[PDB]
Amino acid sequence: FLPTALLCAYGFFASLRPSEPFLTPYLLGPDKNLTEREVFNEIYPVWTYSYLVLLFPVFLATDYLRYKPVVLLQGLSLIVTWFMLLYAQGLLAIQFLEFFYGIATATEIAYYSYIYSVVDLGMYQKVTSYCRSATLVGFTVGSVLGQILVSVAGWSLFSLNVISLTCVSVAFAVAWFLPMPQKVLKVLWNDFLMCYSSRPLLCWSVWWALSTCGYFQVVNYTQGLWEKVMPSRYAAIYNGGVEAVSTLLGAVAVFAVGYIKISWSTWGEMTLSLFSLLIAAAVYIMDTVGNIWVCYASYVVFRIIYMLLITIATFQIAANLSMERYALVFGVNTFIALALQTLLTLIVVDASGLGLEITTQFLIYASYFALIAVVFLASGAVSVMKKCR
Numbered sequence: 534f535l536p537t538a539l540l541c542a543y544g545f546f547a548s549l550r551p552s553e554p555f556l557t558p559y560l561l562g563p564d565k566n567l568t569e570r571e572v573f574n575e576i577y578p579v580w581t582y583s584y585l586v587l588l589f590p591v592f593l594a595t596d597y598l599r600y601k602p603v604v605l606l607q608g609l610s611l612i613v614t615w616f617m618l619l620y621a622q623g624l625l626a627i628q629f630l631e632f633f634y635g636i637a638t639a640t641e642i643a644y645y646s647y648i649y650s651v652v653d654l655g656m657y658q659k660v661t662s663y664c665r666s667a668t669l670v671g672f673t674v675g676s677v678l679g680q681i682l683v684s685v686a687g688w689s690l691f692s693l694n695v696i697s698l699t700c701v702s703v704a705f706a707v708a709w710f711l712p713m714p715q716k717v718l719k720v721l722w723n724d725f726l727m728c729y730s731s732r733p734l735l736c737w738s739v740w741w742a743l744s745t746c747g748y749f750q751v752v753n754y755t756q757g758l759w760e761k762v763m764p765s766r767y768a769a770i771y772n773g774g775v776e777a778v779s780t781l782l783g784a785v786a787v788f789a790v791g792y793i794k795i796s797w798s799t800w801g802e803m804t805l806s807l808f809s810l811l812i813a814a815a816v817y818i819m820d821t822v823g824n825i826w827v828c829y830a831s832y833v834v835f836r837i838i839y840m841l842l843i844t845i846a847t848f849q850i851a852a853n854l855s856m857e858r859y860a861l862v863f864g865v866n867t868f869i870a871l872a873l874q875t876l877l878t879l880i881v882v883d884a885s886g887l888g889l890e891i892t893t894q895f896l897i898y899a900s901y902f903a904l905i906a907v908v909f910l911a912s913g914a915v916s917v918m919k920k921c922r
């Protein structure tokens with residue numbers, strides 16, 4: 534019990550990052566004095582590229598080292614990331630800054646998969662439910678703490694990211710004392726291939742991956758959009774409260790998805806298409822309001838619909854999937870999804886390619902969110918063609 538309590542405490546401390554909601558005013562202010570165009574155009578794409586190229590090696594090293602040193606890697610990466618975030622000037626230094634954050638984020642899969650390597654299989658589901666609940670409540674607590682310390686307390690971000698670094702150091706020091714984790718050419722190629730040679734095997738997969746693409750593309754630059762529609766020089770940004778309420782409602786909706794007994798085979802495609810249409814409407818609205826409270830509201834609704842869609846996707850996949858296939862499928866689909874966001878980054882995001890302005894990148898994205906609905910409807914249309922007969 535005590536190792537598991539240490540696990541949940543370490544996860545709570547590592548996820549407790551008060552500085553996550555308030556990242557954007559730190560860079561724009563006298564703290565770094567960086568051109569935000571250059572930041573948006575160059576700093577972030579190499580993070581995505583490094584995460585793509587580095588996910589596979591560390592994911593295989595987890596099995597190579599039997600999940601033991603990966604938490605140490607995550608802790609050291611947090612330490613070096615926060616040191617570099619406190620000390621970095623120019624362009625290449627901040628490129629390394631974000632490379633460190635990428636190699637840190639690449640080990641969240643290792644964290645969430647190590648839990649299976651030490652506890653009983655029957656108890657694994659309940660303990661990982663407790664772990665994700667701890668992560669969610671730590672996210673909410675950190676967000677509200679940052680909001681209180683920034684607005685209610687009127688404390689500057691300097692002490693806030695100092696205590697963020699202190700918290701990640703405490704997390705590493707706690708995680709150092711874990712117990713022992715006692716636990717491919719054609720076979721592994723067929724291992725993921727068999728997860729697509731059936732009617733429901735291939736289905737929902739690319740849909741989940743492209744929804745993941747939409748979120749991982751919009752969440753990073755939502756901060757920039759909020760800052761550009763309302764400068765922080767003469768305004769205060771309420772990121773902590775919106776993040777807290779969004780995550781709380783997402784968790785509530787995830788819990789409530791299984792609380793209604795509805796068969797998937799009746800109208801699963803219709804619900805998926807409706808969810809995609811709502812997501813496209815939300816992103817087009819947040820593109821086309823030019824205000825502050827309404828754009829937060831649209832963001833909240835978009836987050837909620839995102840959680841509903843991915844949650845029902847996870848139920849469908851897990852019903853289709855097997856007990857030992859979770860890690861492999863979550864690896865392969867994540868890999869192809871990351872290849873896809875990286876590709877689209879080559880088209881639009883980077884300054885070497887087209888480099889379209891962040892403001893004007895959300896126009897077509899409704900049709901991008903609708904194109905996945907069109908092919909779902911195109912698959913639905915054949916299904917509708919075959920439904921009556």
Ligand SMILES: Cc1ncc(CO)c(CO)c1O
Nearest residue numbers: 552553554556577634753756
């Ligand atoms: C530490 C840290 N690093 C990177 C990002 C996203 O680029 C975030 C979210 O804005 C963050 O909190």
